[PDB]
Design a protein around this ligand. Structure first.
Ligand SMILES: Nc1nc2c(ncn2[C@@H]2O[C@H](COP(=O)(O)OP(=O)(O)O)[C@@H](O)[C@H]2O)c(=O)[nH]1
Ligand SMILES: [Mg+2]
Lengths: 265, 1084, 319
């Protein structure tokens, strides 16, 4: 109900320690009233089962949702002392179900950034993290995190190498661990040469080649430095629940190469 | 102080004129009469109080113009008076003399000189008068003088017997309370605030355990307030007499009435809490105002029609029915309402509901033409004595009904109308249908029952009757088939060598029955039959595995054949064979006793006698279905509460007694039992409740859980003590059995690592401070010390044992990367080995393996480490600056964790395989898979726990493949942010038990052969830090679990390594006996 | 045949014997003196003549085809035995008076059961003598324990008090079963009772006085084989029906007829112990039942009872 105030109820949560949760921040000074009405309309679509209608508590500029002690998802606006630039904050527990809830939410937020703010892409994406429970969190610009995601290593403290953090915890929606089990790319089965002899076609995202995934010729979409990672999962969203004999099915994704594997015949 | 107040009880029948008598002299109208202040209670109407809740003088008032008939009517009143206060004075006053000819006066005069003044059974009427009218009279002047002088004489009589006079001195504080209770203004005068009122008046009679009970006792006897002591509205609900009497009397007058309609009226009359209303109804029962019929109805005995409804019984010929008569001089007041309450529960099927009818003076139950029952009053001409008649049809069900009826009648009289036990019992019979019945006393039939003969007509031998038809309750024909005595099985001699014991009931002999050892109770000329049947009633309907059952009864020689214990009583075992008394046996005994108590308490039976002398053992074999039983269900070992001799027994008394039994079991020496030999200290000790620490005082091996159970059980306050149901639940625990020790560490001490000495003490690290501090725990004395030994914080400890060189050293790896090596036999021998290039993350040792934070593995030669500054044999680079080594396991090939890879080593320290486990992310969740390995357990598969994972990975070392996942969250998800589900440590036992510690205070026991949850051990502490497997100095294997208990508290818990087995075995044990309980109860 | 034979109003019968060759002798229970009545089944005729001072307790037929004569022995309350020739009612003989009253008779030789538990045995042709002494006398019970059931079905089963006897060819007690041990089953008031009727085939069927059940005993091991619950069967039927057993008759095809004290007669199959059929409301109270053949040799059941105005009724029931 849009008639509600921006009240934020004192709800005791599970997963109170820093390592118990995932925190994603979206910075922008102001999100023109109506933004959160559109946001909640798209937030009231979240359901990890699709890959239950819990005691959600709408906060006008965000929502509680609740889900379960095991997996929950809080989304809403925030502001800090001496930090007038407002921001969105997402809190899910550090687990796959939380990752799923997060992944669906961040896609809804970005689709809103495309919808409510066409062409704006402000909207700074930060991974909030800590090397020790009870300590102060630090922020990673996801652009730099993606530079490190390419490496596939942990966040390594250069001054104290003894402190390292899994990138997948830092940003669960960066590495596709929340996919339906049947489409996680088996890197030991994707016999993809990437040579011109395998070229089938192309597109704005990059190029289409062929590969012997699990011994079968499949089509492969290489997101060749044309907004990779992002477009890849957005396509996966379209592919999810897309089931018809006349259509090209998904034969596993592949976030590490940014190469979607599709039906070829 | 010299209390000068006395009660005046005025009794008589309605219309006597007794109130106006009182008026001139000066349910129940209560007023003071200062003369000496009398508390006058005028029983105006039929106030059952004289029987429902009976320093007083009785004034018996009757109408002389009615005559001798009225005199006889007063016999029940006199009986009742004698029955509760035979020593109290009675003044008999005839009224209406001004309308009664002296003919009646002298007729009644002679009547009382012949039948009351000189007749036993009545409370020796002290004096008497006749009064013309309540206008005034010389007779009344004399009566006043008589009342005064006689009440003085009475108190003199009390001084002669009781020791108290009309100025007897009572504690002044009780007198004060009387005044405090006088001053009470409450809308619904029910008092609980009395505790506060005690505190208002300073605090007098401060002995709540003794003086308080005496004050209350006094307050009822003195006529001040009302306790109602098994009601819920009893102890904490003191009620104004005026309301109790008024409201209940009114409701009677406001005959079957539904409960609900009564509730409706009551809720408008006086808005009582529904809780109080449930008690209200219970009070109506206890005060004989109304009896429960169905759960929705009340009988309301008073006012029931007194015109016995026309009932035509089936069966007419003499031989078709059985008749029993009870001759009485008069029925006691309330006799019938009490009798009815008992008879309503009769049923020939307890081993469709009956068409019940009520006469006030009788009950008719129908059921079926096959079996029905009529009980009611009948009177014959020329036979002043009133009497009961019981009629049942002559068949087995009819017999069963008869047995129940006569058992209730005799029990009624024993409890409520003793003195009669008069009650001439007659049986009716005839030798030919169509003729008249003949009477015979049951005593004579018992004489014939002993002969076993037919009743034979002394004039004509051709006419005989099979005794059973006349009296099927003299011969035990109403027994369950299961307990009829088979005379071809029972084999006994009654010879001296078989005598097991005796008592007021007769004697007990050892015998054989169906090839088994049994005990035979013989009622050898001790008011038998009645005692026999009482025991039969109690024994039947109690069918629990922990009780001694009945193995057939037989009237022919009047016997009860019961189970004989094989190993004898506990007391003997305690003093004769401690070797049998193992920890396992002891626990099982405690369970079996607790069950018996739970059962008997649910059966509303207070045992009142739990001592070692009453516990019987049927086999010392620890793993048996039934081991201990409680004898004879239905000294200096008393609860301090009941030890006062001024309270009533209840379940809490038994619980306290149980606790003492448990204490006695704990100390197998029976040390407090040995204390009995000096009873002057023993009985008082228990009264004091100041028992010594069973461990420290007697040298008894620790047994926590039980130790606190005893403390919880033996509390001074009855309301604080645990219920017997709860006691059992506590005893029903594998944790109870297997927890052996618990040592708390000093406040604000944090231990991050442990090394037990395999030979009885533990070396402890210390992560509380930021300084290399080494602590030490002595398990033999629970001693504790600590000293700073290094600069940076100690991370890992390891024991170097050189039995060849006869020495051993503690290797302390720390944050600085140094290795401090200290001789266990000499604290002065401290030295440092070659410093590592990074901190030490783990140690293992033969070669001393040092795993450092930079992924480097140093290997030191076995003895070489003795030298200061010694270098390692060789050094390997496994990981890197960001991938530290964290685990060296071995169960002679090494396995271990390095970042996210699993390595393995040969005896030449060469790498035999680097298994990258990152690929497990295809299953589970990538942030769990991608995390540093904490520990590696090596069995027939590898068990991997990673940092902050909730999932344990199972790997096939033979093919290097993921073979399964263990979801710890799932297991605790099944259990109803302490539930983090984070895996802390893994220990593995070669009997398939897998021990998994976690973030919260839980330990999971899994079955390696099936990957299944055996049990969740929990509410251990705040968080589990480390777990070790270690052999004690007794060679017993235990788990050493060190945890946090945030108030930074930490502690060491020692568990019996066989916990997994105890969990399963106990569960089985409990279930088997559960089934047996149902088996027994169902047979009946 | 089911012939409903009615006798004169207030006629009461205490004993019955039929000539197995078509007529029945009946004892006049309604009188105060031994009167002997006689029913002619061929013409439905009925008469009576005085035979004794005391009443008749039991009648029996003595037949000597070698002598071409037959007699009715009258066992009376007096203990005397009057022998009455049926070919000549005036030709009467006398057997030695018993020590007590005669409860039962069975006739080669005549067995005489008495109230004091004795069994006199009179040699067949002593029936022609007056003041004749018995062949042999057995001491079975006593004054408190009467002998009452003589059931040959070639040895004699004896019902005396609570014990079952079996007598040899020379009157030796072959077997003795005290049935008081049956109290473990049933109910003591029934178990402990005088035995009235004993029926024997493969097992013994014991009807005790005032019992609603029949005991079944194993003649081969002397053990209780089972119980027949008559009142149960009447319970199955949808103070007139007390269920007390009055008489047991048994045909070789296991047809056990149980006459009760009411108007019902229970026919039961002893090969399965299963109720076959109840005769409903035969009379108000069945007294005795006898298996016999008519003049046509038709096998009928002589069901004698009362329709209480005592209306004695004999139905010549169709077997
Ligand atoms: N003639 C006469 N009648 C009396 C005497 N005392 C009482 N009664 C009558 O009895 C009545 C009092 O009865 P009460 O005491 O209220 O009834 P109770 O409590 O049921 O006995 C009054 O009517 C009196 O006049 C008396 O001395 N003489
Ligand atoms: Mg009055």
């Amino acid at each position: 109900p849009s008639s509600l105030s921006d009240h934020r109820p004192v709800i005791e949560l599970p997963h109170c320690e820093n390592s118990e949760i995932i925190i994603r921040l979206y910075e922008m000074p102001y999100f023109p009233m109506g933004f959160w009405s559109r946001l909640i309309n798209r937030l009231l679509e979240i359901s990890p089962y699709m890959l239950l209608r819990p005691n959600r508590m709408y906060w006008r500029q965000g929502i509680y949702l609740n889900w379960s002690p095991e997996a929950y998802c809080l989304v809403g606006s925030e502001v800090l002392d001496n930090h007038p630039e407002s921001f969105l904050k997402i809190t899910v527990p550090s687990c796959r179900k939380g990752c799923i809830l997060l992944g669906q939410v961040v896609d809804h937020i970005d689709s809103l950034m495309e919808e409510w703010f066409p062409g704006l892409l402000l909207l700074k994406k930060w991974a909030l993290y800590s090397f020790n429970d009870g300590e102060e969190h630090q922020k990673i610009l996801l652009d730099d995190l993606m530079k490190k995601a390419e490496e596939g290593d942990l966040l390594v403290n250069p001054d104290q190498p003894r402190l390292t953090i899994p990138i997948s915890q830092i940003a669960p929606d960066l590495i596709l661990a929340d996919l339906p089990r049947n489409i996680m790319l088996n890197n030991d089965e994707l016999e993809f040469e990437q040579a011109p002899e395998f070229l089938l076609g192309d597109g704005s995202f990059g190029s289409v080649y062929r590969a012997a995934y699990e011994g079968e010729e499949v089509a492969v979409k290489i997101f060749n430095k044309h907004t990779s990672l992002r477009l890849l999962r957005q396509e996966l969203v379209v592919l999810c629940h897309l089931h018809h004999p006349s259509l090209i099915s998904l034969l596993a994704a592949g976030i590490r190469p940014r190469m979607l594997v599709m039906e070829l015949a």
